Symmetry: D2
Subunit: 300 residues, 4 copies
């Protein structure tokens, strides 16, 4: 009755830093990479026979090798290359999930011009991709999720919250003016891999930020829906977008005990607890792709 | 074509500390609680009408209130109570997911006896539960996952890794003796809620640790399978167990450049990258319950 | 023979968020504040008599009250105000140390123009101050340190390390080209409080970054000295600057086992260990001020 | 006028894991090591000449080499060995500061008996040492600090706070019963190196915990003084002890809005801000040793 179920394995958090230096004007790619293979690894679990298993150490080596041989431009393309490579190398594998985070760098400003080889981290969120490749030859299927994590944004007005359901345990007062502060985590799924990854990423990021700032918010739920639907409207190549946003409470401090007023000016930025508002915006007219999301954000 | 998809919302990371003090011998319950409601919250997203929405601030209040009114013994029972409470209070909700972490405390030792009201954190992993309650009356269904996170364990021998698939990118040497060090994250699903939560948790924890230590390991895959299957064999009330284990590499340092040998004695404990080995052990004869795992470990 | 020695107490990590909203173009001040008082607090330790002790809860309240009553422009001036305020209110105090971190925000870009009230974290290090105020009236003395923390910068060339002391345990090869990557932590001391804080901070920041990028580095030691001395040369109002810089190693990966060369292109970004290079650049012609540095970065 | 001031350099956070395996009952030493050398390193900063400089990479190698050649028993003795070793190898050095953290492991319990080679982290704070060695031959001086960090302890009663200085900004009510929760950070200085390090460490740890639990607390100040003075009374070989303790507030939640009372039972465990109470207990009859504390806890 007892059997092995779902399983996957690979190398997590391979930090690879790639320099392009064909000219004195260097460029950098600063990545954190996860590999996970799926397939027939039953004996490796049940009996200990490792014949099917490519070591995770080799998967790490492959990241560094392909960083040179294939290069690193868009992380989506690097992830697709890695997935197909592992399927070529590991016959027992049925699929590969490659996840990548990119940390952006700007050139250090020297007298108004960016320096040739000196850089400063941009520090405004992490660009992400989750690429799943399954099968080989005519049976190969691939899925790309892209996203942004740790994008810390806030609005100091243009946020309300009223008309909610009131309970015998509700103390929160309705309001027409509050701070709305979050750290956005989001992933969206592409319908195909015929995408200009950098162009679309930059556009999606701008839409998310513009909608957050300019949409008068009646709830974080409604802000997220407006952000996500704007992305889908502008990008028909995107099938769905998931958004997970903490409501990082900035509490208006009561200054009456100190003889002072506080007309929306002085706040306590509380760490925990925080509202956590999570929503998916989807194209109803296209098929779902659960394969793309399997074990995202994690296995268990 | 564009619509709201899956969504959930609630209060994350409510830190509640409950003291039992009916006698001078105090007891403590130190919890971190997440609430998330699912249901008909479409208008709250699409139009901004919050009529269906119970504020996350109220969900936090409810945690503190029920900590007194219902008490906190086993976290599974507290989570079940919270889920049913929210379904009573929020008619638009179809379901509730309550996740809880517990941090264990020991009594401070005073001359051989634990002190009445002075405590020290135990610091050997976090006990967890994820409880999902859906529906009401005769249609109510509930699911309980329990687990352990951040259980840091290692063996200094009794670990091999050889006979693996070798690639043109493989540099790793086969070995019959290595350190196997991990931080275990695991969750298991109960078949019913007629369970002695504390008794079963303690037994499962002991089985996991005993099997890790005493099973001669030919791979982390095989160690995890032996751990998980032992749990299922001893606990027929458990339907499945998922295990996610990093292989935290302790590298045998080359001391030959310094005129020294190193017969398995001096190691460099590397942070990243790390192998990440993930496996599920399941009862083949019982139905799956995907409802229990939805949005575990997270939404996206 | 046993007595109370040095001691200090206060409220740590008061997160205050101040909004300036007299016009629709809001401005933000996002601060983390520490207070610590020194003085005659002996009985509070030895006998338990708290008569001299202002609660740390009150110190927290004071941060919020004065954020409204006095406002928050330059954090140096807010810290000076807080220290003088505590000396007025706590007769037993002989001194106050006020430390502040500021997290910078940019306006969200909306079609080329920054939004009136929507912001995104800048994410390029933390501006800091440590202000010590001692005494009252004609006997009052004050000292201001300002600084930058977590400024993550890297050069991909223009860094060498050769000609070093050799030793039987040395395996490192000399090199004329490497990456130099760090996270800069620095504090400098002002000779007086008659300083345009914002103008000098911005200038010091630019000098540090410009020197890091443009100085050909023969060692992190020499890079830090060139950075610090350039600051002192440009700013006669600064008495000394201390710099603490990890050398976050980016290791050139050996790709020969994979049939590839690696002409300074593919690197492994290692977490730990890291070189830690720490240096002070000082004006030899002005007196030291150890009072300014007492319990920086911490008490023990 | 501009010169190099104080400076030090070395390798930070060398994670060394030492196994003692001369018999089947293995023992573990799990260390994090910092090295910092001081001396005549001026030209290395000012001119870039590295002739005096031993690479930090070599300092890392030395940790691993001496972990085998000398072994690792008490971390105080390993730190002393390392400091003397660097002074022998680096003629320009005048001193060495070696800091070590140790993470304790227990044996996994297998049916009542600890396993020969399977371990679980103890998780109850970090044992630390800071060893400074200056000079050579008859001029050599050494100082040892030892300590405990991240020892998380709490009392649920036996703590009061009343009779404090009142002030116009005070909202805190006096109380005769509260929780006192902290994470203890402490270091003490030994008068000589003729110390049974393990025996004294275990005794000091027990005294700190016993005094915290059994001393009726009128203030964290008074609790820390009672802890420190008890250590000095029991250990004439200890010259001084510094303690830094956050007051991690557990707030009694107001349950009156929910129709419930709360007789000291339900608390909100707040993250930030926190009181920070720091005190030194010293032997008035012995000389100070500022050399032992230089750049503890850090350089700037």
């Amino acid at each position: 009755a007892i059997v092995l179920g779902r399983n996957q394995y690979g190398k997590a958090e391979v930090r690879v830093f790639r320099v392009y230096r064909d000219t004195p004007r260097h460029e950098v790619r600063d990545l954190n990479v996860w590999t996970a293979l799926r397939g027939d690894f039953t004996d490796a679990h049940v009996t200990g026979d490792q014949s099917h298993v490519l070591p995770t150490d080799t998967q790490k080596n492959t990241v560094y090798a392909l960083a040179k041989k294939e290069g690193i431009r868009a992380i989506e393309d690097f992830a697709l290359t890695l997935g197909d490579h592992f399927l070529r190398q590991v016959p027992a594998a049925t699929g590969a999930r490659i996840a990548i985070e990119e940390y952006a760098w700007d050139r250090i400003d020297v007298d108004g011009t960016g320096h040739d080889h000196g850089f400063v981290r941009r520090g405004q969120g992490t660009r992400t991709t989750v690429v799943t490749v399954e099968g080989r030859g005519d049976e190969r299927r691939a899925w790309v999720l892209s996203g942004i994590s740790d994008l810390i944004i806030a609005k100091t007005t243009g946020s309300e919250f009223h008309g909610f359901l009131k309970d015998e345990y509700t103390t929160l007062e309705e309001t027409h003016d509050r701070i709305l502060a979050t750290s956005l985590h989001t992933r969206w799924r592409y319908l195909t891999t015929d995408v200009d990854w950098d162009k679309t990423f930059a556009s999606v990021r701008s839409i998310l930020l513009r909608q957050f700032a300019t949409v008068h918010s009646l709830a974080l739920q409604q802000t997220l829906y407006a952000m996500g639907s704007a992305v889908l409207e502008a990008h028909p190549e995107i099938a769905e977008i998931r958004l997970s946003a903490p409501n990082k409470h900035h509490f208006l401090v009561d200054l009456q005990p100190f003889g002072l007023d506080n007309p929306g000016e002085v706040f306590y930025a509380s760490d925990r607890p925080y509202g956590l508002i999570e929503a998916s915006v989807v194209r109803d007219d296209v098929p779902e792709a659960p394969e793309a999301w399997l074990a995202t954000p994690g296995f268990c």
